[PDB]
Amino acid sequence: FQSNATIELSIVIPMYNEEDNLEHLFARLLEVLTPLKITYEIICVNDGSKDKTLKQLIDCYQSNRQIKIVNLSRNFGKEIALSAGIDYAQGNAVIPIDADLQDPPELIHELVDKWREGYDIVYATRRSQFTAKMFYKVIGRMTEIKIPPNTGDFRLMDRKVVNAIKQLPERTRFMKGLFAWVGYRQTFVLFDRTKWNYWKLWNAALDGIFSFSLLPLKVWTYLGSIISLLSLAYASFLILVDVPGYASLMVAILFLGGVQLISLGVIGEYLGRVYEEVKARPLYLVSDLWGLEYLPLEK
Amino acid sequence: FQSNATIELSIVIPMYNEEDNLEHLFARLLEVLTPLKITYEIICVNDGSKDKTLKQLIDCYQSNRQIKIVNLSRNFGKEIALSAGIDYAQGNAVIPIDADLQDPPELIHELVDKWREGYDIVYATRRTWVKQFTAKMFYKVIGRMTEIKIPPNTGDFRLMDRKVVNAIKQLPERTRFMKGLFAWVGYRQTFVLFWNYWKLWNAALDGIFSFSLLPLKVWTYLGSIISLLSLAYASFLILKDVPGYASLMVAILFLGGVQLISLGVIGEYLGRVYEEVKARPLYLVSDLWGLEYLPL
Amino acid sequence: FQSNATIELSIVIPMYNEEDNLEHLFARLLEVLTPLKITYEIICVNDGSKDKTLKQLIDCYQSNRQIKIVNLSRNFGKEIALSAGIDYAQGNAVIPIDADLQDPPELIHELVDKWREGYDIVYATRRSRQGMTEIKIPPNTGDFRLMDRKVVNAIKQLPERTRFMKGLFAWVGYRQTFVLFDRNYWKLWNAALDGIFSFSLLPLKVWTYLGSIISLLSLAYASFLILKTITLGDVPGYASLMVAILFLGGVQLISLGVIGEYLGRVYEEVKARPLYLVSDLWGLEYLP
Amino acid sequence: FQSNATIELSIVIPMYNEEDNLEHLFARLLEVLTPLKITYEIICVNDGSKDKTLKQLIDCYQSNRQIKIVNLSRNFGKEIALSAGIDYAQGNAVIPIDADLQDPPELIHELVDKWREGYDIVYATRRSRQGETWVKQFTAKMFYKVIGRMTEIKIPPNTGDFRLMDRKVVNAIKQLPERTRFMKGLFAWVGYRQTFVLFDRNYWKLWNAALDGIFSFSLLPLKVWTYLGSIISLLSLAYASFLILKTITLVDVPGYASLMVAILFLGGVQLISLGVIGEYLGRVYEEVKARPLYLVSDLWGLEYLPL
Ligand SMILES: O=c1ccn([C@@H]2O[C@H](COP(=O)(O)OP(=O)(O)O)[C@@H](O)[C@H]2O)c(=O)[nH]1
Ligand SMILES: O=c1ccn([C@@H]2O[C@H](COP(=O)(O)OP(=O)(O)O)[C@@H](O)[C@H]2O)c(=O)[nH]1
Ligand SMILES: O=c1ccn([C@@H]2O[C@H](COP(=O)(O)OP(=O)(O)O)[C@@H](O)[C@H]2O)c(=O)[nH]1
Ligand SMILES: O=c1ccn([C@@H]2O[C@H](COP(=O)(O)OP(=O)(O)O)[C@@H](O)[C@H]2O)c(=O)[nH]1
Ligand SMILES: [Mg+2]
Ligand SMILES: [Mg+2]
Ligand SMILES: [Mg+2]
Ligand SMILES: [Mg+2]
């Protein structure tokens, strides 16, 4: 039989203290990936595990040519450990999976089908009010991806999308709004069996309007400027009408003293985002690699 | 029968939902470019259209070696879609053209002729007291050619030399080249003959903030000297006229007001710093037809 | 017998006016490094010395193949000259020491042993007395340490490598350990505050939320609680005016403190001027 | 004879409306450079001239293999036009001179001599003993604490714009945007081997550049004022927390004498905080801006950058 040096699919699994599930995960994944008759690879990212998960990963690495390990220097975030695996993931399609396996792995057979039709990004949302009517008109046409009962963390992305978001710091939080900005051909498939809180979803909306727009800063600059010209001109005219004494002296100082703190709020928020954009510090660090080559030190 | 590999002219056309005008656009442009006896290319930028404009593009691409398609991932806007096409245009001269042919394509013959005389940028300009005031404020900085400003003139129909495209290639302001960047790059400029001042002076403020630090510096010193006049007014005059409310409110209103536009000029420049340091690209290319991906 | 191309250990010594200690430093260093039977190199960084330190360095350079000199243009400081020496230092392990030998060179034999076991970073912290790791208050871990090649490469482009003991050692992770050896509380939390602002961004966000929610309590109380109760035509006026201008006028200064603090760090991150400048090199090549 | 391929000296001249002085400039410079018996080059930067200076430069370029022209797209500052010429200048030493010839060119023989002695930067400051006053002694005593023994290169009646710089110095500051104001403080930060040569042939801007220096090479104005503004904030918050927690009473203490002063003091310290914050924010924009420092329209006898 012949050989093929091109990888078509890459599954990335971040692991933190997953000593138990390695045998069942690899057996289930093999029973799902083998019938496809397509070359693949398994990127296992050890995220500073303490329960000897790495020792078991290396054992599966020795007896499986598809197992590749990315050992981080310490425990990072789950999203950061996922970004590290995607960086070391070669292949035309990338799909992340969880270790606890809340979603059936057999569903990848349906995701790759939509990818073969031409779709660059294919989500896997489960099937299960005024907010949904809102985001459909502004945020994204496919609001069912980020509905309360399911997050679009189970998805397939083409190589063009992974390459497009390689340098973006928002690739860590790709489901926070970056998916609606990158565009491309998107679709989803349906299936059945913390998060899910509406406070945590409007938190993603607030985190989205500040990250992909300058409106909160610009509309407050113009608003603060027009109330400033009203303040200075009315003070010059008041110093040459009605002088309500305390009914204005307290109102004015406590109004201006309060509006400056929220102005300093949006300034401090955007200043923190500008800092996070200019840091030379990477998202993660790789301690060891098994079955992979290091990324170029240019970065 | 000499095969020339160098592209002499580049026509860049951003298109969003121009399914109807494709037949007349490519045909009427051909009768203008053929008598020039000059190698050229047409860079057609698909800006996320839904009305199957891309399918009609690919059909024209299949039977025309000068048609090259740049398929964007989504709708990004006219200025960004134009910037994407200029990036993939490797010709000695670049000319952006609208698909609805608001300007006659025959002016290309006039644009290239003035370009061969040595001019690096050649424009194509059409022909109350606000018209006398606005035109007078701009000749002090714009220079010899200001007619590209005065309404309804827009310089979006122009010819730019390769040196000019390369000079503004990495600048984020290349999307709004007609917002002030044309007057900063300088070069040898000229034009050929053939609104809303609320938006015209909007670009004046957007230019003073983009190419200068004067509003921030001037207000920094202006707010600093009134801070010294402040602290000194309560430094020596506390060891001991007191209009009471006539100044307690005014000072509260005055000192609180000069800070609000101090945070305004700071908040404006801070947003510009974000737009300069953000890692998010200007656009994303979904597919390419007849072109290679960048960087080459 | 046979030549060896790869250097295994690198000793980095920042030097400022060390004309006298050179004879004893190089002799005692050779006494410690020779029994290791391991190829090494000594990177000597001249940090703008005013005495005859450089002349003695060149003399030792001429008769010793392991002495290499990095001459800085001017005096940049102990930390910057240390970063400059690590940049021009190749080898699997890097160990910085001082010219005045409060750091006994014999501990290198123990530092390399812990590194042989798999530890990527091995500290040489002094014993405390008085009254993992976390020895950063009593005498505390200093610039006496061993770092694997993977660790020095990971923080090569980071500006925080100058102050690696200010918090970067806790962020990089890796396998870490320390070794104890013998022979102010204000700087403790001065460096602790210097760490919570560089690797966290929480002091800015927490004060952003706090300053904004007290702005809502402020604005809501004066906009239409006072206007709604005096539209019919109060709390002690002077006491309320005084407590309002000083509470609001002072909390804004803390917001300006954290904003100015982070703005200065953004300037230090985007400035194009380098950290140091090399005037001459002896036994080394220029970078990049 | 034989041919040498390395350039030993580079003379950079920014030119703006120098049509008349070109004939006297190139001839007098050639009479100074020939006896040195070392290879050299003359980089002429056309800085958006409005007359026929460029046409005359091209004529000198056609008959002189040492004349090279850098034509900028438009008129920039003299600092920018000089930085553009240094970028296209290849050579072991670089010397910038003015076109109107305000300083004698014969000093090059002394600059190269000091350069061959080992000095990386050699200045040529004028010798003026006039204007000795107490203010000059104050400025000299305050600037000597940071600049060093070489600080004499900036008395009020002279600057250090006539200098020789080694290739290592021009390379060290090639990517720095502050190279246009190299004589505004950057010369003292590079710290290379420096000396000057003497020859005899406003205080507003001096301390203005010093104020620009403490902001350009330091963070003290921002750090000191944030610390100061914070400790007076602690005094303001605490003292007001006890003025509201003093329930042992119920109209005013000092009424207008203190309260009007209070809004004034807290309102003024914030304006200085906004002053230093806005000042450093503008410098951050100048460091992160993608807009280049200059643009080159044409080149004669040179290659475009990068190589
Ligand atoms: O610090 C962490 C935490 C999480 N994980 C990985 O992320 C998944 C988190 O699973 P969990 O059920 O807690 O999150 P959820 O299923 O709700 O998305 C696990 O498979 C871990 O392998 C990780 O690598 N590092
Ligand atoms: O979102 C858009 C809108 C405009 N266009 C193109 O930009 C040009 C603008 O022409 P239009 O007549 O629509 O605008 P106007 O003439 O008013 O300037 C047209 O060729 C469009 O194809 C585009 O690429 N994306
Ligand atoms: O400005 C300086 C001061 C320190 N050093 C070097 O750093 C080490 C620290 O020595 P020092 O005794 O001054 O530091 P301390 O003992 O107080 O920790 C010495 O080898 C010096 O040569 C230096 O290169 N430049
Ligand atoms: O806008 C300018 C002004 C100055 N110069 C050049 O800089 C030098 C300084 O000229 P000027 O005599 O006007 O300045 P000053 O002699 O007073 O220092 C001259 O050789 C000019 O060619 C320039 O290139 N562009
Ligand atoms: Mg789980
Ligand atoms: Mg139109
Ligand atoms: Mg010491
Ligand atoms: Mg002059």
Residue numbers in the entry:
A (entry chain B): -3 to 124, 133 to 197, 205 to 251, 258 to 316
B (entry chain D): -3 to 123, 129 to 195, 207 to 252, 259 to 314
C (entry chain A): -3 to 127, 146 to 197, 208 to 257, 259 to 313
D (entry chain C): -4 to 196, 207 to 255, 258 to 314
From the paper:
Sugar attachment to hydrophobic carrier molecules for transport across membranes is catalysed by polyisoprenyl-glycosyltransferases (PI-GTs), integral membrane enzymes conserved across all kingdoms of life3. GtrB is a bona fide PI-GT as it carries out the first step in the glucosylation process, generating UndP-glucose on the cytoplasmic face of the inner membrane, which is later utilized as a glucose donor during glucosylation of the O-antigen. The structure shows that GtrBSyn is a tetramer, with each protomer consisting of an N-terminal cytosolic GT domain of the GT-A fold, a juxtamembrane region, two TM helices (TM1 and TM2), which form a compact stalk anchoring the intracellular domains to the membrane, and a short C-terminal beta-hairpin. The soluble glycosyltransferase (GT) domains are separated from the TM helices by a juxtamembrane region that positions the active site 15 Å below the membrane surface.
Subsequently, although probing the function of the enzyme with structure-based mutagenesis, we produced crystals of the point mutant F215A, which fortuitously diffracted isotropically to 3.0 Å, allowing us to improve the quality of the model. F215A, which resides in a functionally relevant region of the protein, has compromised catalytic activity, but the structures are essentially identical, and unless indicated otherwise, we show here the better F215A model. The structure of GtrB from Synechocystis sp. determined here at 3.0 Å resolution, is the first for a representative PI-GT, enzymes that attach a sugar to a lipid carrier for use in glycosylation reactions. The UDP-glucose donor substrate binds in a shallow cleft on the surface of the cytosolic GT domain, in a similar position to that determined in other structures of GT-A fold GTs19. A divalent cation mediates the interaction between the diphosphate of the UDP and a signature DXD motif20 (94Dx96D in GtrBSyn). Despite the fact that UDP-glucose was soaked into the crystals immediately before cryoprotection and freezing, interpretable density was only observed for the UDP, indicating that the glucose is either poorly ordered or was hydrolysed before data collection, as has previously been observed for other GTs21. In the 3.0 Å resolution structure without tungstate, we cannot see side chain density for R122, and the segment between R197 and N208, and the limited resolution (4.5 Å) of the data with tungstate does not allow us to reliably assign previously disordered sequence in the map. The active site of GtrBSyn is located in the cytosol ∼15 Å from the membrane. First, ∼900 Å2 of predominantly hydrophobic surface is buried between each pair of GT domains in the cytosol, with eight inter-subunit hydrogen bonds and two salt bridges formed at each interface, suggesting a stable structure that is unlikely to disassemble for the GT domain to move to the membrane.
